Amino acid sequence: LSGLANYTNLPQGSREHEEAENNERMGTFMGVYLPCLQNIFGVILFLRLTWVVGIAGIMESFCMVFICCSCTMLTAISMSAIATNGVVPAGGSYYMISRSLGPEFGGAVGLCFYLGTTFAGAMYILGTIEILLAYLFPAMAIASGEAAAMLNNMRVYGTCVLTCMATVVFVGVKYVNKFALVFLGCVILSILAIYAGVIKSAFDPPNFPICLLGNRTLSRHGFDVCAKLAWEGNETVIQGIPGAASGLIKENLWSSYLTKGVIVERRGMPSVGLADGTPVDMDHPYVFSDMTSYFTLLVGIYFPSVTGIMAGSNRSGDLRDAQKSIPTGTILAIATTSAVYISSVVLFGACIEGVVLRDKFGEAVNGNLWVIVIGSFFSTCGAGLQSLTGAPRLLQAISRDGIVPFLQVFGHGKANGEPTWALLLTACICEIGILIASLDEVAPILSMFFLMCYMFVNLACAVQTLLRTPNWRPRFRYYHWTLSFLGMSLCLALMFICSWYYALVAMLIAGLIYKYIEYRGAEKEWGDGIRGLSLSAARYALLRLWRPQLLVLVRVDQDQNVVHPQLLSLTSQLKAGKGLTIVGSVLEGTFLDNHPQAQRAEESIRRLMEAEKVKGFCQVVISSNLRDGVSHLIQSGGLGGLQHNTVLVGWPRNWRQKEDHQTWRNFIELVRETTAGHLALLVTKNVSMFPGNPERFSIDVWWIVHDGGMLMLLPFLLRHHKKCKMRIFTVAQIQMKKDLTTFLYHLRITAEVEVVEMHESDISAYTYEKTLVMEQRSQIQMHLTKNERERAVRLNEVIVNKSRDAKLVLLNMPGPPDENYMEFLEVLTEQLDRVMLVRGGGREVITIYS
Amino acid sequence: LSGLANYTNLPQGSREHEEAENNERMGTFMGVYLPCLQNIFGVILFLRLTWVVGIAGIMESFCMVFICCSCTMLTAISMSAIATNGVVPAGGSYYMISRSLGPEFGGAVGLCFYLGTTFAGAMYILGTIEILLAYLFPAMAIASGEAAAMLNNMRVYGTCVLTCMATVVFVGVKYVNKFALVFLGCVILSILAIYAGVIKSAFDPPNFPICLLGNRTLSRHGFDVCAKLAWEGNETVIQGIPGAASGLIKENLWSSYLTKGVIVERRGMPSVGLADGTPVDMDHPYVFSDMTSYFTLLVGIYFPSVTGIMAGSNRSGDLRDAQKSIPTGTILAIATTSAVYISSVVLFGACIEGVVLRDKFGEAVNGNLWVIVIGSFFSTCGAGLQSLTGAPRLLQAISRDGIVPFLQVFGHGKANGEPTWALLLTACICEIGILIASLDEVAPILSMFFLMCYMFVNLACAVQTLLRTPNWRPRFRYYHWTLSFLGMSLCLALMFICSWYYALVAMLIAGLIYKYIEYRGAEKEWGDGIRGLSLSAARYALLRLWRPQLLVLVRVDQDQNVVHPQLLSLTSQLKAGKGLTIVGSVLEGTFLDNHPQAQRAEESIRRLMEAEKVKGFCQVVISSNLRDGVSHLIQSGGLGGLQHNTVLVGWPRNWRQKEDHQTWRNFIELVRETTAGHLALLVTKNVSMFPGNPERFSIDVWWIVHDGGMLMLLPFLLRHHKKCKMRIFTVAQIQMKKDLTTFLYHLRITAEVEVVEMHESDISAYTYEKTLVMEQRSQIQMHLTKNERERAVRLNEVIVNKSRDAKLVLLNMPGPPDENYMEFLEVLTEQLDRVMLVRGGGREVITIYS
């Protein structure tokens, strides 16, 4: 049989995910459209929507229906955005949200959706026997102005039918498997019946009114007359008159005003007159109003009729595509119901005084070809039985995963699915919602749970897009993060409109399970608890993943003692504890023989590191050769994207001292290593006589043609720690003075002067490098506030001492040559006291604060 | 002069921090106690506190004063906790909070405190000319039932005096330096005067009442009589009578009930009688009430009289100790004012009908030896002038640091401190608070700003203690994080009691500067912006800083290709993407010559790593020798506390094949390296024939006497990925079967059997190791759910094949011997198909889920 064979509305659950994953059909969109439509036409269309049309303006209830439509369509867009970033495995919406958001939003969404559905199981079981006591045969339990006796009347019948359909769901769930299609017919025939009844628009059951009252005609069947026969009659009930209008009009209503009664008698708008001035506290045959009916009390009664869209994707796996059927079988399925709730709210501009909630001559809607008062019974029974079976099967899915540890008992089952203890708990926490025993006070409770469940989805699917989580890539139309952010804001606003003093409490509870799952999850994988949390956060911040962040290469003395703490005193003030600093070292060979040496060395360097007030990490490597215990730090510094950008090192002071030292072959191989690794180098020459604690009271930099721009960030970073003047000294072989002055003034950096120096001959030059630098520069904008200049090696001229010997000096090193490394060791320390030779890499974009 | 020489109440600020830090006195506690007391006795004690005693119950206003006392004392405890974890440098409270919390809470506290003080400058300038228009000579600006003409009256005089003391603060701030002591006398003489007046308790200025009315005696000076002379008189104003009580009683009041008027006439509690039933909408000589006076409207009018405690530490640096004077000069200074507000609220149980706000015969308090109506003028002038000078000096301190980038203009000054544009902005945003022009509506605005400023301090100083930030160690009595958490909760509750729809808005604004400072701060130090944020978060989560987190040692083929992806398929299912996994490799030498080899190798291994669904980091090291390119990974794996706990490696398959291979000396040196590094080892023997994607359908472990407990975590981790049975097989040479069965059942792990095997001889044994393990075990509890057992090497018996050849096998390796490493290569692969040899370290606590 095409269609009706193998069709339900109940969700998939836990067992049909276990089967789909252990052993590792094909319904169309029409099997995921109709279940989204079946459980969304609930009970607030048949017996409370016309009261919303009556006890509020049509131009206010239109805005109510529109904003409650947008509040859930803008979340079904996020359901479209979640159904494409993965393989949409099996089970209901819970496994989708869990495997697409981690366990942490999955628990906080699943518990709120469970608390929503387990009060849906109360709100529909409480409105399915109002029909018995108001429209079918009354079987009440007792008079004399008793308005709270109906409360105790409805409690016992509600508890009886709750035990009835909690029994019939435990045994014989194949029965509600079988009856899954007639519950759709009982909705759709009744709604087509009332559209046909509006299309008739001819007849009316008339009412009977007083002068400006309602005169509820339960037993007053004398047809609006005090006395009319051959002799007079009693009709004992008077004050002014008694007319008889016809309520079910068809031509024109113009009921576009808000008439909010407050526990008083109903009144037609200017029928004849009114003439009294006294107390009117009688209890006679008149139709009163139940409670006050302001706006924010009414939106929380309307909102449970637009809920259940994530139960429109509970049929996963059994689809054939499941990545197009979930969006187009929900957005169409929410639009085809929004069309009903918007056309019907203005298409009830035919009745007159539909503000009476219960009855005037005992009829609910009365605009159809008496069908609706039994079609709206099996519909409400089925929508209260779907929310009964579905709710324990969600506790089984939450408890099965071990996401919550004290949810251990509730994954028991009876030999094939069929949750047992979860049905007991949902019966208890539905029973504590049935003792409230009024349909208008369980709706702002149920509404708030579905609002926070819809709000956490929009909060998650907009923060996964900003914070680029790796397994988060949606493949659907729209679903932009601004749209889900508007969904967040709209769901949060409609949460605080309903009841804010419950919104804060039930959001701080739902924002507290999200930390408890994080504690019990960060304990399982790291084994520590309070450290694994911080540790896990570091792992996520690395997996989700200019200014110099450096590795400093100090060496250790004959003991486990550092040899030049002035280098640490220079790197503390170059960087000021703002960034990444790896402080490495290297020892002799064979870790077996020397691990106490490295232990005491890292203890000493960690003692030094906090004394100079620098925040970083130490790594001490034991290696056989001294060279490849440095080239095994440069290649492997930080862990992930925390790569060191540059390497700082001291000059080899005792060069050419020993006979076969080979400690400067180490240095030249280091320079070639750092340059061919695309990495910058900072070598300090006279490592002693650098200031530590003591302050000072003219930093001079020497722009050679290469590697500039880095030459002016470093004094710009040094002056923030203990402040002198600075002298830019460029070299050339004209108009660049004005360009450099405008560049230094456009940054408004400091009091930097400028001197133009022209040298006929200066080595370390190559013209085919700016064309290699511009290929990387163009691969990266407008408003370029960066320094771009248009226009045997002796190096014994050395004009950089005629205006020098004042303060810290900076220069560019020449490029390394190959053989003849001893000829590369030219030393520019003819008279320079302290100097820090720099050498940049290739890719150095220095845009802001250069 | 001892005392009065060099004493102010104004805060320190920006310039006197710059001077204290560029050039790098001695007042006692009495110079930090009295400034905390001077600006806390504001204007709501003299002209609105008695209205709170009158228009609310004394047993409700007592609870009001008590909870507003606790709300700020429980924050001054956090001010004690912040004043000891550092060196309390200079400036006001802003530099303390900034340097002790980072810039991020510092900006969000400084802006809220600035917005609090700049409306203090309005609330005191608006209540300093109510005294002119109600108690001094009226100079009003126009009658005939005009209650809003007083509003427009007060606006122009308030704007005039605001321009007056905004002018006199810009030029001649040495004048308010000079007058800083008389403003304390004008408080303390007046409050001692009213205590002396209560100590008198003898006399009274009497009033004149109607039957049950107040009869405001502005011009009705006929002394409560209709006509009394030799002839009658008019007194034209009647209804019932006119008595004349005496208000200022002394014996007994018993006014302990809440009498909340709502825009009606005042009425004594049962004076004589009342006799009328009609409309009473006249405007005659009677004292009416201004507005409704419910409780949460009144706590937000009382709260601006307990504010200003962080201006009790604005005198930093100029103290001599500053680490004991700040707590004991604030807690005593808040207790000595709480004592006043609690004794005075029950010590106004002497007056009668003090519910009239403005005047009955033109007197404010009238319980002193007329002094108070001028002592409460200079006090309010000084407390409105302190909040004028202080507020721009705080914008200078916020703008100077560059914490906020668009606050660039407001650090201008005039040649020595003296902020100029900040005074213009605080004049404008005080002027938009003076146009509200009512003292009772600028107080729930000002109150909310000081409440969120007090709430962020309690939020910061309780999260710095849980999350162990390194430069956060307080050294003061109490200051426990539960106490500051109660401060958080109490400040948040008193925030939402006042005005919740402004609480959410002005908390989402103050929770939005905290992210803008984080964006503009994480851009300055990392240069990237959106990545530096995540990067910075990783750095903080590492600096703030059992289950195996492993480094796997794969090797690369003749190309840049991996050689055994089954090892990655084993480490994907051993760990399931939950933890840290470093996937290392090693190549030939000389990085210069081989960096494209390492580039393509890490590209290939990163291609493989995501294909097996394992989340980790790859590091590829080029080194000359193949050995110390492995021992330079084991010593330096992860960056900080993300150290790899164990090393996984494949067995050398082609052992003893080449003539001089020396690839197994590598392996034995690896085993000695890993054991003497206190690190665990996992070596897979037959690396091919391990399952990848395909599932399976009897894991057997072999407990040798050493290193157990780890032997049962690994199958317990393997079965969560694709599920067979398991066989525990221990060895001995009795009662341990029952102990092992109770241990395996107490964890309720799986269907593990148990076989006891006894061998007469088995090598790799030493008895003096459990005494070395128990020294580490005792250094770590109760309810020990861990496995603790009480009771030429041949290795050719090999009884581990009589019940074997089924599934994955696990064993303990023997300890390495020294020479004769080729004799250590005994192979237990007589018939075992797949086997993963394990070897633990020393420190393996395996408490939960073993």
Author numbering:
A (entry chain B), B (entry chain A): 85 to 108, 119 to 236, 242 to 336, 366 to 497, 508 to 683, 693 to 844, 848 to 872, 876 to 886, ...
What's written in the study?
The mKCC2 structure is in a similar inward-open inactive state but with an inhibitory N-terminus peptide in place to block the translocation pore, and with a very different dimer architecture compared to KCC1—together these exciting structures allow us to propose models for the regulatory mechanisms of CCCs and to gain insight into the defects in known human mutations. In the case of mKCC2, using mass spectrometry we confirmed phosphorylation at the two sites in the C terminus (T929 and T1029) whose phosphorylation appears necessary and possibly sufficient to inactivate KCC transport function; additional evidence will be seen below from the blocked pore in the mKCC2 structure. Within the TM region of mKCC2, we noted a helix-loop density that we were able to assign to residues 85–108 in the N terminus, lying in a cleft between TMs 1, 5, 6, and 8. Residues T92 and Q96 from the N terminus interact with R443 and S444 from TM6b, while the additional N-terminus residues N93 and E102 interact with Q524 and R538 from TM8. The presence of this bound N-terminus peptide is a marked finding since at this position it is expected to completely inhibit function: in addition to the inhibitory interactions with critical TMs 6 and 8, the peptide completely blocks access to the otherwise-inward-open pore. Compared with wild-type mKCC2, a mutant with deletion of residues 85–120 in the N terminus was found to have increased transporter activity, strongly supporting an inhibitory role of this N-terminal region in KCC transporters. At the extracellular end, E224 from TM3 interacts with R142 from TM1b to prevent access from the extracellular side congruent with the apparent gate in hKCC139 and above in hNKCC1. Furthermore, analogous to the intracellular essential residues of hNKCC1, R193 from ICL1 of mKCC2 is close to D539 in TM8, forming a polar interaction, and from sequence conservation, it appears that all the CCC transporters utilize this interaction.
